[PDB]
Amino acid sequence: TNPCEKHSCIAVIDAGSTGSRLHIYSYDTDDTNTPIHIEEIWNKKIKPGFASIQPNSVTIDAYLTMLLADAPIHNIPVYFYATAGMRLLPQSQQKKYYDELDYWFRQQSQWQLVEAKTITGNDEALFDWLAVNYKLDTLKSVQNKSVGVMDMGGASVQIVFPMPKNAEISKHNQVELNIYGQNINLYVHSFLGLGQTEMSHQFLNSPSCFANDYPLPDGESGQGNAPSCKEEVTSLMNSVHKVNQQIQPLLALNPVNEWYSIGGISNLASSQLFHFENSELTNQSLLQQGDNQICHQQWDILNGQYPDDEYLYQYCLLSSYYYALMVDGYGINPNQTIHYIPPEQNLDWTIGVVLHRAL
Amino acid sequence: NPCEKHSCIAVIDAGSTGSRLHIYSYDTDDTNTPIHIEEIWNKKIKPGFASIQPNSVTIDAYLTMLLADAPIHNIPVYFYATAGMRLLPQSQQKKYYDELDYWFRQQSQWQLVEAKTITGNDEALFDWLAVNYKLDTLKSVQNKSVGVMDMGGASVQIVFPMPKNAEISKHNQVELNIYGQNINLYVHSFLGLGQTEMSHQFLNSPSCFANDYPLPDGESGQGNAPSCKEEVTSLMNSVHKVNQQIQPLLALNPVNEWYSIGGISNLASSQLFHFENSELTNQSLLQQGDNQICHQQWDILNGQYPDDEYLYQYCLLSSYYYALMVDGYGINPNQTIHYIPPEQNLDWTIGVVLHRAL
Numbered sequence: 001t002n003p004c005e006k007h008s009c010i011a012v013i014d015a016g017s018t019g020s021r022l023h024i025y026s027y028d029t030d031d032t033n034t035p036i037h038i039e040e041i042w043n044k045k046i047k048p049g050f051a052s053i054q055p056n057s058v059t060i061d062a063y064l065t066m067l068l069a070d071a072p073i074h075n076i077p078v079y080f081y082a083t084a085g086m087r088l089l090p091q092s093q094q095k096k097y098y099d100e101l102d103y104w105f106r107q108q109s110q111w112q113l114v115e116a117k118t119i120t121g122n123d124e125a126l127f128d129w130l131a132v133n134y135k136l137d138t139l140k141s142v143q144n145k146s147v148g149v150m151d152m153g154g155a156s157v158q159i160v161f162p163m164p165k166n167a168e169i170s171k172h173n174q175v176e177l178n179i180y181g182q183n184i185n186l187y188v189h190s191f192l193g194l195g196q197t198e199m200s201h202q203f204l205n206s207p208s209c210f211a212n213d214y215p216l217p218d219g220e221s222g223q224g225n226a227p228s229c230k231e232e233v234t235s236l237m238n239s240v241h242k243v244n245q246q247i248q249p250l251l252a253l254n255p256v257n258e259w260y261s262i263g264g265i266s267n268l269a270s271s272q273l274f275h276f277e278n279s280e281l282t283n284q285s286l287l288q289q290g291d292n293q294i295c296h297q298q299w300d301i302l303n304g305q306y307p308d309d310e311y312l313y314q315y316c317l318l319s320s321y322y323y324a325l326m327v328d329g330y331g332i333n334p335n336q337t338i339h340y341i342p343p344e345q346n347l348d349w350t351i352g353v354v355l356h357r358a359l
Numbered sequence: 360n361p362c363e364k365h366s367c368i369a370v371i372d373a374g375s376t377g378s379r380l381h382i383y384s385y386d387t388d389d390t391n392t393p394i395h396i397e398e399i400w401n402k403k404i405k406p407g408f409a410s411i412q413p414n415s416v417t418i419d420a421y422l423t424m425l426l427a428d429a430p431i432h433n434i435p436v437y438f439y440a441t442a443g444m445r446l447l448p449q450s451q452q453k454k455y456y457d458e459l460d461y462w463f464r465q466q467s468q469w470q471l472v473e474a475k476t477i478t479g480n481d482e483a484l485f486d487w488l489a490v491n492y493k494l495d496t497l498k499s500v501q502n503k504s505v506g507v508m509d510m511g512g513a514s515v516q517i518v519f520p521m522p523k524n525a526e527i528s529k530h531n532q533v534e535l536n537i538y539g540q541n542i543n544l545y546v547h548s549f550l551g552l553g554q555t556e557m558s559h560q561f562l563n564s565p566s567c568f569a570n571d572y573p574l575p576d577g578e579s580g581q582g583n584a585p586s587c588k589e590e591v592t593s594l595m596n597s598v599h600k601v602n603q604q605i606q607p608l609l610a611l612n613p614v615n616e617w618y619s620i621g622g623i624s625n626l627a628s629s630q631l632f633h634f635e636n637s638e639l640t641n642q643s644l645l646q647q648g649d650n651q652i653c654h655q656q657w658d659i660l661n662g663q664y665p666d667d668e669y670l671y672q673y674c675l676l677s678s679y680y681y682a683l684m685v686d687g688y689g690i691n692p693n694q695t696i697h698y699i700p701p702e703q704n705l706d707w708t709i710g711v712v713l714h715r716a717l
């Protein structure tokens with residue numbers, strides 16, 4: 001069966017810093033031609049990030065072929081939206097990637113490329129909030145509670161929550177959204193350089209951030225201590241980026257009732273070393289588990305016991321960093337529940353694109 | 360044929376932004392130490408080795424592009440990677456080396472001696488040996504202290520003479536004997552403070568770009584070098600504690616002449632900046648970047664200078680170099696800093712030719 005013969009279908013590609021994810025969505029539309037019944041009918045993910053690969057024909061051909069070739073439906077519109085990995089590069093370097101990608105799409109006849117472009121972290125934050133609230137079924141009716149969303153990426157992190165329009169705040173950080181006949185005002189912010197890969201490049205020689213005896217590039221040995229690593233990461237959040245100064249006053253005035261996180265935190269929280277129930281965690285418990293299970297354990301033993309976790313060596317650092325970002329940066333209480341979407345649900349911001357081309 | 364009358368060696372600098380193959384001819388003095396070191400071949404390729412996908416196809420293409428057209432084979436080769444590879448865990452670096460080893464064991468003209476990631480402290484030692492070799496200061500005991508700075512894409516090094524002592528970590532002190540003389544150096548490298556890695560923390564800072572430059576988040580540049588420098592100094596000092604680590608040692612071991620290599624040579628040599636005698640001061644560098652890039656209208660300035668791919672970054676880079684050298688290292692903003700002309704192709708690889716004989 002091809003659902004796309006009976007329902008509208010589009011393909012959306014999340015071209016993230018650490019990899020690209022193709023989704024094919026089928027949907028119907030209600031009275032205003034707004035999508036409903038959105039279903040993912042195909043998903044494929046590849047590594048590494050599109051902005052990391054050499055921008056020549058042969059490399060981009062291998063990459064796009066790997067991403068698209070085995071898709072069961074090809075004669076549909078395609079949106080290719082890159083996020084913070086491409087935002088790291090100047091517009092001149094990005095142009096080479098889009099020229100090669102445009103050329104590739106023109107060498108074949110099935111996929112109809114609608115747009116290929118780098119979106120801003122503010123657009124990425126709006127799509128993050130739309131994607132999670134569509135899954136929560138909170139978009140069709142006016143809500144009593146405030147839902148905030150966090151997306152933990154490899155190069156940037158987003159935070160987005162309801163906030164009335166404020167003339168003192170940049171226009172770029174505020175979005176007025178009309179969807180399903182309701183009007184929604186959002187604060188959006190993205191912090192470029194505070195994603196997990198970029199942040200980690202500032203702490204690779206910090207012994208407190210690695211399991212005991214992990215080999216640091218300077219020849220010293222890891223000596224893990226999550227509260228100590230967390231204080232180091234907080235200097236990058238607040239002394240450098242001023243996360244606390246920008247976010248805490250706004251959340252004080254516009255409290256969030258439920259927090260949902262997507263991105264890398266879902267993967268860490270779901271791993272064998274951590275234990276959380278009901279797809280929810282607290283920062284207090286995340287930091288204590290990371291400290292006890294990873295930071296204070298012997299690297300050779302951990303490495304041999306978890307040979308499939310390719311991110312294991314960063315788990316002490318990540319536990320520390322997520323705490324630094326959420327508690328010290330955003331001002332979230334260490335005991336506050338944070339929901340995370342299970343990784344097997346393949347939920348990224350791309351559902352937001354399905355919804356908001358129509359609004 | 361230069362190698363029929365001289366010893367010859369190939370050294371590859373596999374840096375964060377690309378790899379540079381050098382082939383050197385040399386003679387040796389009475390202790391078999393190199394002298395008369397002459398570059399007889401140079402080839403540079405981009406991007407950095409640690410940035411490419413680690414499969415046998417991609418690595419063969421990369422090594423082929425680097426080595427194929429070399430005029431001389433049948434010589435020892437050192438493949439030394441620096442901070443780009445230091446960004447990767449050993450398990451991922453192992454994939455690169457395993458493939459690279461395969462490639463060399465296959466062919467019969469290059470003689471691979473070693474392929475490894477060198478520490479930042481070793482890179483700093485080689486930085487110091489290469490510059491002093493070129494200055495002709497190694498033959499005899501110097502009356503003066505020469506310090507060297509290497510400004511890379513992912514790490515920066517600093518290295519200067521310091522007498523042996525019980526106080527400082529042995530990990531950052533190096534002793535060598537060369538041309539019959541005993542030299543003791545302090546060495547340090549700061550990973551993540553190279554220009555590429557540093558810049559990823561400030562791309563949405565309007566103070567760090569020309570007026571109306573389009574920032575990735577949709578806001579506009581509004582350049583102000585002093586402000587941009589203050590932002591970069593928080594990463595130098597509040598995060599890395601550069602000042603606390605470096606300034607007490609330089610106070611105790613003052614440097615008479617500073618030489619710099621790496622990205623600063625390319626910036627200072629560009630058409631936007633004006634320096635005489637291949638030397639700059641930090642205050643002049645900051646003033647020039649502020650006037651000639653930070654406070655300019657981006658589209659107009661880009662149209663005036665079409666030939667410079669790095670132009671958009673010059674407000675940030677002038678601010679960053681001042682933050683690192685003045686706020687981090689404690690160098691006086693009016694102190695002369697020599698930079699080696701880029702055309703000279705001086706990286707730390709001459710240090711390897713010298714050090715492997717000691």
Ligand SMILES: [Cl-]
Nearest residue numbers: 217218479550
């Ligand atoms: Cl290092």
Ligand SMILES: [Cl-]
Nearest residue numbers: 053054411412
């Ligand atoms: Cl590649």
Ligand SMILES: [Cl-]
Nearest residue numbers: 120121575576
């Ligand atoms: Cl952004």
Ligand SMILES: [Mg+2]
Nearest residue numbers: 016083153154
């Ligand atoms: Mg993402």
Ligand SMILES: [Mg+2]
Nearest residue numbers: 374441511512
């Ligand atoms: Mg270098």
